[PDB]
Amino acid sequence: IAQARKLVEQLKMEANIDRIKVSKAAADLMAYCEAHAKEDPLLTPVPASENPF
Amino acid sequence: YXGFX
Amino acid sequence: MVTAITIMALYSIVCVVGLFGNFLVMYVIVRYTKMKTATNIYIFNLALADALATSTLPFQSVNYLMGTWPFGNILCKIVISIDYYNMFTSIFTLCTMSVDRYIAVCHPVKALDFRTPRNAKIVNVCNWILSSAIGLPVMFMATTKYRQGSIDCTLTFSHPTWYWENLLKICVFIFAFIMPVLIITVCYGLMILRLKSVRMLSGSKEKDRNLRRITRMVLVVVAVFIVCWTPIHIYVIIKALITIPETTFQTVSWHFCIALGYTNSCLNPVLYAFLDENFKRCF
Amino acid sequence: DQLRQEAEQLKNQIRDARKACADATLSQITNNIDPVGRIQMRTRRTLRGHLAKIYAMHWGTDSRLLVSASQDGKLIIWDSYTTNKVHAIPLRSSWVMTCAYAPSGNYVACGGLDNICSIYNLKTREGNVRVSRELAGHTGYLSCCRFLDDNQIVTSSGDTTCALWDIETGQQTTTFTGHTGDVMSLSLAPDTRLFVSGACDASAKLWDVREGMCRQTFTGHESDINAICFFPNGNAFATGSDDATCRLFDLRADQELMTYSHDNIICGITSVSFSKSGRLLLAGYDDFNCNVWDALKADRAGVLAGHDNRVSCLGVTDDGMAVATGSWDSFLKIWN
Amino acid sequence: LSAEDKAAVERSKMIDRNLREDGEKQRREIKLLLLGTSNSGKNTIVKQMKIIHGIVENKFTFKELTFKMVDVGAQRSERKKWIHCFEGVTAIIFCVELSGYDLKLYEQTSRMAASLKLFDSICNNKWFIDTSLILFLNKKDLLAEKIRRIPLTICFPEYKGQNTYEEAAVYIQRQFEDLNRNKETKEIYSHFTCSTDTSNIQFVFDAVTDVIIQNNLKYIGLC
C-alpha cells in the first residue's frame, strides 16, 4: 500500500506546478534559435580556411 | 602452354 | 584453309571470353568485396594469374596465322616469361585455395589462428615469388631463331640439349600436373569426408540438398581442372617421345589441347567467383 | 484502496491542466519562419582502430579531444583533428554501453552491464591512464553516465533508478527513484542543476539534483525511450524511442510540443543531439544512417548516410563545428 | 610537421599496433552466452567444466580452443534492452533443470513452463536466428529418481507413456526442441550433464567446432 500512497504525494507535487502557455515556451525556443543562429557552424557552413576539418 | 616451342 | 580459320576462331573466342570474365571478376572484387577476406584475396590472385595467361593468346594466334613472329625478340621474351610465370601462378593459386578450404573445414581450431587477410597476402606474395623461379629462367633463356623464311620463338639450349629438354619438360609436368592434382584430390576428398558429418548438412531434405550441391561443386571443379590440363601434358609427353607426322588432325589436336589448357583459365572465374555465394549477394 | 482512485483523479487533473495550457504546439507559430533548407554534411575524418561494436562516444569540452567505447574492451581517446589516438584505455569489462568525458578533461567514465561505473584519471603522473574509482551500488546496468564536475557524477541504471555520486567518497549522495522501467539515457542541464532521464516506460522524468526528487514527468511515446538530450538553453529537451519517433518536451509547459517522424522510418532511435543554435536535431537510427531534423519545422533537413550498420551513438562538439557518429561497423565518422 | 606532431603520430602508430595485437586474440577466443532459468544449474555446470577433471566471465582453454562463457544471471533488468549486445555470439549454452517439473516455487510459477517460455523467447529472438544453442539438461539422476514416484503428467497434461526415465527424458527433449521455429538456420545440441571426466566441455567443444565449420563454410562462399 506504500507504493500507491507514495505515488499519491508524487502526483500532488506534480499537480501543484506553474504552467507556461506553449505559445510562450515555443516562442522562447524560437527566439533562442534565432539569436544563436550565426554561432552555429552546422546550420551556417564555415569557410574551409577557418574550418579545422 | 604447349605454344611457341 | 578451314584448319587455319578454325584455330584462329578457337583462340579468338577463348581469349575474348577469358579476358571478359577475368576483368569482370576484377571489377566485382574491387567494387564490392574490397579484398577484406582471405578467400577474396585468393580469388583476386587467381583472376590476375588467369588474366595475364589469357592475354598471351593473341600472340600465339598471330604466330600461327603468319607462320612467323613479327613482334620481335623484345616481345617474344616477355611473352614467354608471362606464359610460364602466370601458368605456374594460376596452378599454385588453385592449390592454395584448395588447401585453404581444407584447413577451413577439417581444421576449424587452427583456422582461427591462420586464416587472416595478412596471411592470405603473405601466401599470395610467396606464390608470386616462387613462380619467378621458373618465369625468370625462361625469361633469360628465351631466344629468337631465324630460318630461310621464318622467325621463330624458342629457348636457347644449354648442353646437353636432350638433358635440358628432359629436365625442363619433366619439371613442368611434375610441378604443374602431378602436384596440383594430388593436392586438390587429397584436400577435397578429406573435405568431403569431413563435411559428411556436419549436422547442418546431414539433416533434413534441404540440408541434404545443400550437401549434395557442395559435393557437386567440388567434383565439377576438380574434373574441370583435370580435363582441361591432362590432354596438353599427355600430348606433349607423347610428342617428346615419338615422331608425329604433320597432318591436319595433328595440328587440330595440338591447338585444341592448347586452347583447352587456356580454357581452364577462362573457366576458373565461373567456378570460383560467379558460382560463389558471397559474390551473388552483391546486388 | 481509496489511494488508487484519488491518484487517478490527480492524473485526470494534471492532464486537464496540460490540455488547457496548450494552444499552439509549435506548429501555428513556427510556420512563418524560413526553413533551414538542404544540409549536406561531408565526412572530414574517419576514426579507425576499433575492432568491435561501438556503443558510446562523448566529445570533449575543448571540441578537439573525443572518447569512444567498444564491445572489444577499449576506451579510446582520439584527437579529432589529426586522427591520432591520444589514449587507449583497456577495460576490465568489455560490455560497455556508455562513456563520459569530464568537462575539465581530467577523467573519463565507462559503464555498462558490469553494474560498476569506472572513473579513469587521464591527466595523471607516471604516464599511462589508471582507474581512479569504481562506483558500485546499481543492480541493473548503467545505460548513461554524465559528469557534473571532477567529483560529482550522475548515472542512469537499468534497475529503474538513477544515482548521483561523489567520486572521492564513492557513495551515493542521492538516489532518484520513481521509474517503473529501465532508464536508457540521461541529459544534464546546461547549468547542471536539473537533468532528464527517459525510461522503458515511455516516460521521461525531470530530476533536481539538490534534493533528489522528481519535478516533472512527460509521456506520449508508445515504447522504450532510448535517447534524451537537453535543448541548449535548458528550457526543453528531446527524446527518441523505439517507435521510430522523436518528441520535443518543454519543461515550463510541462508537455509535448512537436513530433519528428516519417512514414518511411520504422526503426527506433539510438541517439539524439542538438546543434548549438538548437535548430537542428540529429538522431541516430537503426536504418544504418542518421537524420538531421529541423527542430522548429519537424522536417527532415538532411541525412548522414555513411555507415554500414546501426548508428548507436551521436555527438556534437561544444562549439558545434562538427558531428561525430559512431555505429556498429566499428567506425566513427566526423561530419561538417 | 612539427617535432611534437611527429612524436604524436608515432604514439598513435604504436597504439594502433597494440590495438591490432589485442584484437587478434579477441577474434580467436570463443564467446558463449550462458542462459537459463533460476536454479537451473548454470553455476554447477561452470564449476564442473572448470574442475571436473553483475557479469561472470569464465575463460579457459580446452583442446587448444579458448572459451569465454558470459553469465549474466545475477543481473535483474529487462532482457530485450541488453540482449542486443550479445549479437554475433558464437553459441548460447542454455541450461534446463530436468527434474524441476514439480518443483515450481520461484516467486504456481511452473518453473519448467518458465524454462519453455525462456527457450521460446531467446531461440526465436531476432538476434539469435543464426546462433546455435547448446541445450544442457541437468540432474538427470534426480529425474530418474523422481519420475517413478511423480508422474510427468503433473507438468505436461498431454503426456502419454511410461513414467520412467528414458521416455520422459526423450519427451522433454522433444518438447524443448519443437519450439525452434528456425530449423534451417540454427541447430540445437542437446546433452545430459554428468559428473564424469569432463564430457560437458567435450560436448561444448564439439558443438562449437561444428559452429566454426558452418561459419567457415559461409566465409569461403560455399554457403
Side-chain angles (χ1 to χ4, degrees), chain A, chain B, chain C residues 1-7 9-156 158-161 163-283, chain D residues 1-70 72-336, chain E residues 1-51 54-223:
Chain A
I1 199 70
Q3 296 82 4
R5 68 180 65 252
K6 182 175 73 175
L7 204 69
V8 176
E9 292 84 4
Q10 177 64 37
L11 259 64
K12 294 181 176 67
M13 293 182 286
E14 182 65 26
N16 319 137
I17 289 182
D18 207 53
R19 275 70 173 174
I20 301 299
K21 291 181 78 68
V22 307
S23 72
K24 189 62 168 67
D28 288 349
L29 291 175
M30 182 179 72
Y32 182 91
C33 284
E34 183 178 1
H36 300 269
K38 299 298 293 295
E39 293 83 3
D40 205 354
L42 300 166
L43 188 152
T44 297
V46 167
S49 68
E50 319 317 296
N51 188 323
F53 290 102
Chain B
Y1 146 67
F4 322 102
Chain C
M1 176 66 222
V2 175
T3 301
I5 191 66
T6 298
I7 294 169
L10 183 62
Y11 290 166
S12 66
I13 296 89
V14 168
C15 177
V16 165
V17 298
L19 295 174
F20 293 9
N22 290 315
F23 287 23
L24 293 174
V25 166
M26 305 273 180
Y27 182 76
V28 176
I29 285 168
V30 302
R31 177 179 167 184
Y32 296 92
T33 61
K34 309 291 184 184
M35 294 182 286
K36 293 187 286 185
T37 304
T39 186
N40 288 118
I41 292 163
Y42 294 128
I43 291 164
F44 187 84
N45 180 296
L46 192 67
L48 182 61
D50 288 339
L52 298 175
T54 49
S55 86
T56 51
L57 280 185
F59 301 100
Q60 296 178 356
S61 66
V62 168
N63 178 67
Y64 180 91
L65 187 146
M66 293 180 183
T68 178
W69 185 263
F71 305 102
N73 199 21
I74 170 182
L75 268 153
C76 178
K77 293 174 73 67
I78 62 170
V79 162
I80 296 290
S81 179
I82 285 173
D83 197 69
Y84 272 85
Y85 186 56
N86 288 283
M87 156 192 177
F88 270 91
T89 304
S90 183
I91 285 167
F92 275 114
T93 303
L94 292 178
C95 302
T96 300
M97 304 194 38
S98 299
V99 176
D100 186 74
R101 290 178 174 180
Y102 165 77
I103 293 296
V105 170
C106 289
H107 294 269
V109 171
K110 273 72 67 179
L112 293 167
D113 298 311
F114 303 158
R115 284 200 68 252
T116 61
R118 180 175 177 275
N119 277 336
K121 296 169 186 176
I122 288 169
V123 175
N124 270 3
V125 171
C126 288
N127 280 336
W128 274 107
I129 297 300
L130 185 60
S131 296
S132 296
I134 296 168
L136 185 63
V138 307
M139 171 91 178
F140 287 124
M141 295 298 102
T143 193
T144 301
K145 300 289 94 175
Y146 182 76
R147 303 177 193 274
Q148 298 88 338
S150 68
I151 304 169
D152 289 336
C153 284
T154 181
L155 307 175
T156 185
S158 306
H159 293 279
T161 70
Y163 175 78
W164 205 93
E165 294 293 328
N166 279 348
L167 181 63
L168 177 63
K169 286 183 185 180
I170 286 167
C171 285
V172 169
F173 174 66
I174 286 170
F175 283 99
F177 189 75
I178 284 173
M179 294 299 291
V181 158
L182 261 173
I183 285 167
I184 64 171
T185 294
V186 170
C187 286
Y188 281 133
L190 292 173
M191 185 199 184
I192 293 300
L193 287 172
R194 183 60 184 80
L195 282 177
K196 282 200 180 100
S197 297
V198 174
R199 288 193 181 183
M200 185 64 72
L201 299 175
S202 88
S204 73
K205 286 179 180 177
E206 188 73 13
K207 298 175 177 179
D208 179 7
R209 189 180 73 83
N210 281 333
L211 176 58
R212 287 174 186 274
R213 192 264 303 277
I214 290 168
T215 303
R216 190 176 69 241
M217 294 299 291
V218 160
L219 287 173
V220 66
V221 164
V222 176
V224 159
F225 173 82
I226 288 170
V227 176
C228 284
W229 277 113
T230 301
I232 192 66
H233 282 292
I234 290 297
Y235 182 76
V236 162
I237 287 165
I238 301 299
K239 183 181 290 291
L241 265 293
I242 293 169
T243 300
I244 308 298
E246 181 180 358
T247 70
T248 59
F249 166 73
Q250 181 272 338
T251 59
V252 179
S253 177
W254 171 256
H255 283 275
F256 183 76
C257 290
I258 288 169
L260 191 64
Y262 283 96
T263 297
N264 188 239
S265 300
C266 158
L267 288 179
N268 272 342
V270 162
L271 294 174
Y272 283 102
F274 296 92
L275 294 174
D276 204 47
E277 292 276 344
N278 300 352
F279 288 87
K280 303 205 288 282
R281 286 187 188 97
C282 296
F283 289 100
Chain D
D1 294 291
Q2 188 274 331
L3 297 165
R4 289 183 290 277
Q5 69 264 22
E6 73 178 3
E8 294 301 318
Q9 190 273 331
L10 271 178
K11 267 182 199 283
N12 296 295
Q13 182 181 2
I14 288 169
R15 291 173 327 104
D16 289 345
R18 294 184 294 173
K19 285 182 286 188
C21 182
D23 47 357
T25 66
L26 263 175
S27 70
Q28 293 179 356
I29 58 171
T30 63
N31 55 0
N32 295 316
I33 65 170
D34 288 340
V36 70
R38 197 215 70 193
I39 288 174
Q40 278 283 17
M41 280 170 238
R42 270 137 299 181
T43 308
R44 312 295 193 193
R45 309 286 191 281
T46 299
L47 312 182
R48 307 145 173 295
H50 275 306
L51 300 176
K53 301 167 73 173
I54 286 165
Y55 284 115
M57 61 79 70
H58 200 206
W59 272 112
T61 58
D62 55 359
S63 303
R64 175 166 189 165
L65 288 181
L66 179 144
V67 63
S68 68
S70 56
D72 52 73
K74 282 294 180 302
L75 258 187
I76 303 185
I77 299 283
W78 307 81
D79 192 324
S80 74
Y81 295 146
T82 71
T83 300
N84 301 340
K85 298 176 179 69
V86 183
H87 285 105
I89 313 159
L91 310 181
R92 193 153 164 181
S93 172
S94 67
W95 314 103
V96 60
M97 293 177 70
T98 187
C99 73
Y101 182 76
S104 74
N106 298 266
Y107 301 96
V108 295
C110 78
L113 301 182
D114 49 332
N115 291 112
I116 299 166
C117 188
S118 295
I119 311 293
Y120 292 109
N121 195 349
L122 293 183
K123 300 289 94 175
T124 187
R125 184 176 177 87
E126 182 65 26
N128 294 325
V129 175
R130 292 183 291 113
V131 61
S132 69
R133 273 288 188 279
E134 282 157 278
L135 311 171
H138 282 313
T139 53
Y141 51 82
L142 297 75
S143 64
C144 192
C145 302
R146 285 289 172 271
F147 275 94
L148 287 160
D149 59 12
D150 269 20
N151 191 29
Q152 278 187 309
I153 184 166
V154 188
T155 69
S156 295
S157 178
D159 58 16
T160 64
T161 69
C162 300
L164 167 49
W165 316 68
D166 267 8
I167 289 175
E168 303 209 323
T169 57
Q171 299 295 22
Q172 297 179 47
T173 71
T174 179
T175 303
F176 306 90
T177 58
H179 275 302
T180 52
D182 306 346
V183 190
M184 284 303 113
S185 60
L186 186 141
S187 183
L188 286 166
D191 63 358
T192 64
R193 292 180 179 91
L194 309 166
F195 75 97
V196 289
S197 66
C200 292
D201 304 337
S203 68
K205 281 173 145 159
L206 165 76
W207 317 85
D208 186 74
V209 305
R210 297 285 75 78
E211 293 83 3
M213 65 182 179
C214 171
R215 191 174 296 281
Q216 291 169 236
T217 303
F218 305 82
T219 61
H221 275 288
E222 293 83 3
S223 195
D224 304 357
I225 293 171
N226 297 317
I228 200 162
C229 284
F230 263 101
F231 197 79
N233 67 2
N235 288 321
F237 66 98
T239 61
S241 65
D242 275 334
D243 59 8
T245 300
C246 296
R247 299 292 179 90
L248 180 69
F249 305 101
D250 187 89
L251 278 72
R252 288 184 292 164
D254 195 3
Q255 65 191 293
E256 172 164 290
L257 286 181
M258 185 180 288
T259 187
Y260 317 108
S261 68
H262 202 280
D263 291 331
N264 290 318
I265 304 169
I266 62 170
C267 73
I269 323 296
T270 48
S271 282
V272 291
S273 283
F274 272 96
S275 76
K276 300 289 94 176
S277 175
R279 183 70 183 268
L280 302 178
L281 166 67
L282 290 93
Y285 295 67
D286 306 332
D287 283 324
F288 299 177
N289 57 56
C290 315
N291 288 319
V292 179
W293 299 93
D294 191 340
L296 308 182
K297 298 293 183 182
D299 294 343
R300 189 172 59 180
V303 184
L304 311 184
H307 282 287
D308 295 350
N309 206 325
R310 166 184 305 189
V311 187
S312 70
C313 43
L314 196 153
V316 185
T317 56
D318 277 353
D319 63 358
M321 294 299 291
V323 181
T325 68
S327 66
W328 283 0
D329 54 17
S330 306
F331 293 153
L332 283 72
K333 295 192 187 302
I334 302 172
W335 310 71
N336 175 277
Chain E
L1 299 170
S2 307
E4 299 99 358
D5 287 348
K6 292 175 185 176
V9 170
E10 181 175 358
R11 177 185 172 81
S12 178
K13 304 271 181 83
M14 182 179 72
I15 283 169
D16 268 342
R17 264 211 310 280
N18 279 83
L19 289 175
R20 271 200 326 271
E21 190 277 331
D22 292 324
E24 178 67 29
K25 181 253 177 301
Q26 302 297 322
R27 171 186 155 268
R28 292 174 176 182
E29 55 100 354
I30 286 201
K31 298 175 180 66
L32 307 170
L33 170 61
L34 193 72
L35 290 176
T37 43
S38 305
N39 302 349
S40 62
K42 294 181 276 178
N43 289 337
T44 302
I45 194 66
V46 166
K47 288 188 282 188
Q48 276 177 148
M49 278 153 48
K50 280 186 184 178
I51 62 170
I55 297 169
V56 183
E57 293 179 343
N58 290 318
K59 186 183 288 185
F60 49 89
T61 64
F62 183 73
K63 296 293 186 290
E64 293 83 3
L65 186 57
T66 303
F67 307 119
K68 179 182 176 181
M69 294 183 286
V70 183
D71 182 359
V72 300
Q75 184 177 2
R76 181 69 273 171
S77 68
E78 198 201 352
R79 185 178 296 113
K80 75 175 181 65
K81 301 304 292 192
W82 56 258
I83 201 69
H84 62 87
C85 70
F86 293 104
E87 178 197 7
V89 71
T90 297
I92 295 169
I93 296 176
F94 190 85
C95 292
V96 167
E97 189 185 25
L98 202 61
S99 70
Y101 59 92
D102 68 332
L103 298 204
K104 46 189 179 183
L105 177 61
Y106 281 157
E107 296 181 354
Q108 299 295 308
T109 183
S110 298
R111 74 161 63 200
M112 182 84 96
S115 293
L116 276 296
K117 187 269 183 181
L118 188 77
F119 193 98
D120 170 343
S121 181
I122 62 170
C123 183
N124 296 320
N125 189 359
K126 65 185 181 184
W127 299 116
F128 303 130
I129 296 170
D130 295 330
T131 292
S132 77
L133 273 74
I134 303 166
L135 179 69
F136 278 119
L137 310 169
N138 296 294
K139 313 185 195 180
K140 65 182 177 65
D141 310 345
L142 268 66
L143 181 64
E145 293 296 329
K146 183 186 288 186
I147 193 65
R148 76 190 73 189
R149 307 177 294 108
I150 293 100
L152 191 58
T153 57
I154 193 66
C155 183
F156 292 99
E158 294 294 328
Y159 177 45
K160 297 296 289 183
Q162 296 184 94
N163 296 115
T164 184
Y165 160 62
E166 288 82 7
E167 293 82 3
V170 171
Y171 182 55
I172 295 172
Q173 293 180 356
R174 178 70 275 172
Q175 279 291 276
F176 270 99
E177 290 173 358
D178 63 358
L179 275 69
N180 180 15
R181 305 201 280 81
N182 296 115
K183 297 180 170 72
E184 295 83 1
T185 47
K186 65 198 280 167
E187 198 62 276
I188 295 165
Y189 304 76
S190 300
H191 187 67
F192 288 84
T193 68
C194 49
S195 299
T196 187
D197 193 14
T198 62
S199 72
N200 296 295
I201 197 62
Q202 186 73 50
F203 187 81
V204 174
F205 175 70
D206 296 334
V208 299
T209 298
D210 291 331
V211 175
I212 312 185
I213 288 169
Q214 290 175 199
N215 293 319
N216 288 352
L217 288 162
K218 291 188 288 293
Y219 298 148
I220 64 188
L222 288 199
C223 302

